[PDB]
Structure formats: C-alpha cells, structure tokens
Amino acid sequence: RGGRLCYCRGWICFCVGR
C-alpha cells in the first residue's frame, strides 16, 4: 500500500492516505 496513494485522472487528481 505504501502509505499514500495519489491518482491523477485527466484534469483532476486526488490522493488518499491510510
């Protein structure tokens, strides 16, 4: 899982941390 996952999809990018 790493820790924080940032997903960028086009002109919007969100990132979630656990």
The CA distance from 12 to 18, in Å, is: 20
Contact 5, 14 (CB under 8 A): no
- Tell me how crowded residue 8 is: count the other CB atoms within 10 A of its CB: 9
Contact 15, 3 (CB under 8 A): no
The CA distance from 7 to 2, in Å, is: 14
DSSP state letters, the chain: --SEEEEE-SS-EEEEE-
User: Determination technique for this PDB entry?
Assistant: NMR
Contact 14, 6 (CB under 8 A): yes
Encoding tokens for residue 8?
């960028």
